[PDB]
Amino acid sequence: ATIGRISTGSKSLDKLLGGGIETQAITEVFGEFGSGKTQLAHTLAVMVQLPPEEGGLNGSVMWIDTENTFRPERIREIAQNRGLDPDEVLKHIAYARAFNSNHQMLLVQQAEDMIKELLNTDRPVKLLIVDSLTSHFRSEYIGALAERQQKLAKHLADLHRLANLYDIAVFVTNQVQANGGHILAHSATLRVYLRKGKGGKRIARLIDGEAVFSITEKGIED
Numbered sequence: 720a721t722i723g724r725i726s727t728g729s730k731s732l733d734k735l736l737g738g739g740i741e742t743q744a745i746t747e748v749f750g751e752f753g754s755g756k757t758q759l760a761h762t763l764a765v766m767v768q769l770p771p772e773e774g775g776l777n778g779s780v781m782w783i784d785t786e787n788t789f790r791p792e793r794i795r796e797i798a799q800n801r802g803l804d805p806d807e808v809l810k811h812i813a814y815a816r817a818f819n820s821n822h823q824m825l826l827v828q829q830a831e832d833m834i835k836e837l838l839n840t841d842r843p844v845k846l847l848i849v850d851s852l853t854s855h856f857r858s859e860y861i862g863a864l865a866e867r868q869q870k871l872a873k874h875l876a877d878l879h880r881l882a883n884l885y886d887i888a889v890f891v892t893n894q895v896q897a898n899g900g901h902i903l904a905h906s907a908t909l910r911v912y913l914r915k916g917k918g919g920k921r922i923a924r925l926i927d928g929e930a931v932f933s934i935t936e937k938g939i940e941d
């Protein structure tokens with residue numbers, strides 16, 4: 720398949736990304752608590768449902784939530800301010816809460832079944848969100864870094880396999896602050912560092928210029 724791109728909602732961030740986040744790729748956004756990673760996830764879950772002329776892929780979404788941070792009412796707001804019907808947008812987001820890191824890993828295998836079911840339809844899965852990818856692994860494997868890295872490596876390999884095999888954009892969030900961070904090392908296809916700037920602006924930079932955007936009723940925008 721050709722590489723599809725999903726607009727983030729911000730022209731600035733899209734330019735930094737070469738058009739948007741890519742299918743057949745894992746995009747990892749990392750930054751401190753409150754930097755806007757989950758807002759970007761919510762915005763992408765709407766944008767992907769637009770037609771390509773508007774920066775989407777007419778796609779369905781699957782969302783694995785590890786921190787109870789998915790907000791359907793926020794999806795509704797972004798959808799209504801992106802000219803989409805909010806009910807239709809929510810009907811095309813499959814949502815699961817991961818109870819722990821092992822359940823999170825099983826959910827990726829379960830996601831493959833729905834991906835296959837929708838593959839030949841007019842609304843194939845085009846976006847798989849894992850928010851937060853690392854939170855359960857970090858809490859469960861305190862003092863056991865080597866084992867944590869083994870499990871994360873398999874989890875990321877599973878996500879890679881889905882991105883490439885089914886032409887999906889995988890978007891994962893990772894909280895990194897004071898003294899923290901192996902990030903995801905070199906595993907993601909693309910690492911985006913997100914941070915707060917003056918006056919509530921958000922700033923993004925590729926790791927391995929800078930885009931600037933705001934959180935608004937449209938999700939994010941310039």
Ligand SMILES: Oc1cc2ccccc2cc1O
Nearest residue numbers: 781782813814815826829830
């Ligand atoms: O109904 C489902 C929703 C999911 C969401 C995320 C990952 C896997 C899922 C599997 C489902 O059957």
